[PDB]
Amino acid sequence: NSFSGYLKLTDNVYIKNADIVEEAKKVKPTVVVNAANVYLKHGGGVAGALNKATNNAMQVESDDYIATNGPLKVGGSCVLSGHNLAKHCLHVVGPNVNKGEDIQLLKSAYENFNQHEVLLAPLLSAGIFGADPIHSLRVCVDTVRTNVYLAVFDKNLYDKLVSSFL
Ligand SMILES: Nc1ncnc2c1ncn2[C@@H]1O[C@H](COP(=O)(O)OP(=O)(O)OC[C@H]2O[C@H](O)[C@H](O)[C@@H]2O)[C@@H](O)[C@H]1O
């Protein structure tokens, strides 16, 4: 695969200090993961950046998905187009711990990754949703069995994560 410069964490999990949008643009992976909310309203963080890079096509598609199917579940997912970034985007909803949602649902969220052989992904719930980032990384490592390439935008966070036990 064309993923380059990743640090190996485990047999199947790799990590890099990179913007997921730039990784997706360069690699054009089969699957890029979005850290979504249940309404697929891609406002900020990973979702807002991915959507911006698609010139809002991701949001237009997402609005039709919701109109047809209704909100996702917390811990749930749907497969939509990856537009100009990837073949597919797997939109995954981690728990919004800052709004009282159960952190246990982070494991359910990462289980969705096992339906795909290779993914480029962020650390779910670790941003605006308020989960401890090292916890999200540990849940990823302990849940995902398929090959995951994690893109960590924030340099300070990356440096801390790669120096922490799993
Ligand atoms: N471009 C990026 N590339 C890689 N990692 C990033 C990027 N931007 C942020 N991160 C990191 O990615 C991690 C996740 O941060 P978040 O994207 O907030 O996701 P969540 O699951 O916590 O919140 C979901 C909400 O965020 C959106 O508003 C949605 O629309 C949802 O409403 C953090 O470590 C970030 O530093």
Curated annotation (Swiss-Prot):
It catalyses: Thiol-dependent hydrolysis of ester, thioester, amide, peptide and isopeptide bonds formed by the C-terminal Gly of ubiquitin (a 76-residue protein attached to proteins as an intracellular targeting signal). It is a multi-pass membrane protein. It is found in: Host endoplasmic reticulum membrane. Coiled coil: none annotated. Inhibited in vitro by GRL-0617. Residues 1-166 form the Macro domain. Responsible for the cleavages located at the N-terminus of the replicase polyprotein. Participates together with nsp4 in the assembly of virally-induced cytoplasmic double-membrane vesicles necessary for viral replication. Antagonizes innate immune induction of type I interferon by blocking the phosphorylation, dimerization and subsequent nuclear translocation of host IRF3. Also prevents host NF-kappa-B signaling. In addition, PL-PRO possesses a deubiquitinating/deISGylating activity and processes both 'Lys-48'- and 'Lys-63'-linked polyubiquitin chains from cellular substrates. May form homohexamers. Interacts with N protein. This is Papain-like protease nsp3. The lineage of its organism: Viruses, Riboviria, Orthornavirae, Pisuviricota, Pisoniviricetes.
